[PDB]
Amino acid sequence: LVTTGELFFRSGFGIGMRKDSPWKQQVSLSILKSHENGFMEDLDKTWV
Amino acid sequence: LSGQADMIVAPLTINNERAQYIEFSKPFKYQGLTILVKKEIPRSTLDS
Amino acid sequence: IISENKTDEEPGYIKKCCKGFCIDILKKISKSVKFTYDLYLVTNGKHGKKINGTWNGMIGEVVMKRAYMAVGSLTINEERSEVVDFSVPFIETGISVMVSRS
């Protein structure tokens, strides 16, 4: 199996949840912190 | 939306049909769409 | 523009006009949400660097309520998101290395 073509409809992933909840700002900040720090780079190198 | 759960931590895409009801966090992985097709088998040296 | 610090005058502006990538997105959004706008470039700073708890650049203009919607090449991270509220990203960037092929 091989992969061809070029990417279209480039929309990322996300963590869904209900409209009214108190976790939104903290969850977004934690995800951004994990991106900036370098944790996701370590995670990708092991599982994907 | 039925109050059964509170988070959808999973591979959930982001578009406009969903974002009117639930609130998505910042993406933790970018991607797109891509075709996948089977590949053939190469040749050989035949009779030397 | 700002004249010499020795002697200043009334604030004057030379009306240029900006075109590019984000400007067309602004035009489309304005055509959809039917709201007006008027751009104006910034002078002090380029993108915003915190000094002594203050700010400068586009972010500095946003925080002082002088402007209302920064646009251009503002990338999102932890520190900036605590002051302003960014929107959904429309492009993917990061950090990369540029070298010449030997």
Would you kindly provide a written description of the structure presented here, covering whatever features stand out?
The structure is cut from a larger assembly and holds two copies of chain A (48 residues) and one copy of chain C (102 residues). Chain A contains two helices and one strand, in the order βαα. Chain A has helices at residues 24-37, 39-47, and one strand at residues 2-3. Chain A is mostly helical. With 102 residues, chain C is mostly helical. Chains in contact: A-B, A-C, B-C. Chains A and C meet through helix 1 of A and loops of C. Strand 1 (2-3) of chain A pairs antiparallel with strand 1 (36-37) of chain B, so a sheet runs across the interface. Chain C: It is found in: Cell membrane; Postsynaptic cell membrane; Late endosome; Lysosome.
List the helices and strands and how they pair.
This is part of a larger assembly, with two copies of chain A (48 residues) and one copy of chain C (102 residues).
Chain A: E1 2-3, H1 24-37, H2 39-47
Chain C: H1 22-33, H2 57-63, H3 78-81
Task: Give a quick precis of the structure.
The structure is cut from a larger assembly and holds 2 copies of chain A (48 residues) and 1 copy of chain C (102 residues). By secondary structure, chain A is mainly alpha-helical.
